[PDB]
């Protein structure tokens, strides 16, 4: 079925220095209708409509429940699903994807997708599920396996769909197995993470009582900071989105757009979490993220059940 990319905006709270400077709040929201207003110094507001609008006190729990939970349900049924985190360095991309364990309601979409997948796969008595994970990093157009034996090894992108040749896949029989791969991946990151893209993939294979196998993959992507060969994957993402909404798509311009070409206009249900700052000192970057997120709503995907 024809389905548009769902876009949600998340505004982080002020940090300590912003409070010490008494920094002006230039972001407003009307979460019932997904409205985000951005105020300029002169007083003129710029208004945007999104599929979700999560303000300074929002939690990873309420973001997951409203926006990601139905996509993860679809992955279990056999669909491909992708969640990207987009925004400047310091806006909350990693806090939205990974989150924190010190405050349970602030746990990210990745730990939450693990709990959801292992709960839902066990409560479906008709289907037997096998879960596998992969975790890669793209820095300077160099693709690296974050869980492999040699993490330094640069890997090639080939097509059979599109895949990373030599990318290790790790069986996960439960949530602890999943969380060990997350910390393992973190300790193997390039030396900090602001200029690279990371992709955590969860493969959910379901075997029915008949014997029919369905295969849905979940891509959880933490993009490099959008602040204005290092910036090629980000520039190509913008160029791809422009072609997709402008009515040829240059997926091959970068490693990131080649790998995720099915997430942008292909067989996948995609969600974009655009992260913004509440501060008037970040106005220019926030306006850039909001315009990018607004444009991203017009991308048309064609997700079908992989069975
Ligand atoms: N919603 C939030 N609530 C509390 N702290 C947050 C929130 N979003 C981000 N932070 C804090 O802001 C800082 C930067 O966030 P981070 O996720 O690392 O951003 P990014 O990955 O986009 O560079 C961190 O110190 C993090 O704890
Ligand atoms: Mg980060």
Author numbering: 1 to 160, 164 to 194, 202 to 238, 254 to 272, 276 to 335
The authors write:
The best crystal diffracted X‐rays up to 2.1 Å resolution and was used in the analysis presented below. Although ATP was included in the purification buffer, ADP was found in the OSM‐3 nucleotide‐binding site, as is common with purified kinesins. Accordingly, the region from Arg238 to Lys254, which encompasses the C‐terminal part of the Switch 2‐containing L11 loop and the N‐terminal part of the neighboring α4 helix, is disordered. In addition, the L9 loop of ADP‐OSM‐3 is poorly ordered, with residues 195–201 unable to be built in the model, similar to, for example, the kinesin‐10 NOD but in contrast to the helical conformation found in other ADP‐kinesin structures. As this loop comprises the Switch 1 motif and is part of the nucleotide‐binding site, this observation agrees with a lower involvement of Switch 1 in the binding of ADP than of ATP. ADP and the associated Mg2+ ion are however tightly bound to OSM‐3, as reflected by their mean temperature factors (about 41 and 44 Å2, respectively) that are similar to that of the nearby P‐loop region (residues 86–96; 39 Å2), taken as a reference, but lower than that of the complete model (52 Å2). Another characteristic of ADP‐OSM‐3 is that the neck linker is docked onto the core motor domain, the ‘docked’ state being a feature of microtubule‐bound ATP‐kinesins. In the case of ADP‐OSM‐3, the movement of α4 might be facilitated because the two loops (L11 and L12) flanking α4 are mobile in this structure. In OSM‐3, this residue (Asn334) interacts with Asn80 and Asn295, similarly to what is observed in kinesin‐1. To sum up, the ADP‐OSM‐3 motor domain shows a standard structure of ADP‐kinesins.
OSM‐3 belongs to the homodimeric kinesin‐2 subfamily and is the Caenorhabditis elegans homologue of human KIF17. Similar to KIF17, OSM‐3 is involved in intraflagellar transport in the distal part of the cilium, and both proteins are autoinhibited at the resting state. The OSM‐3 motor domain shows the typical kinesin fold, with a central eight‐stranded β‐sheet surrounded by 3 α‐helices on either side. We have determined the structure of the motor domain of OSM‐3 either bound to ADP or to AMPPNP, or devoid of a nucleotide.
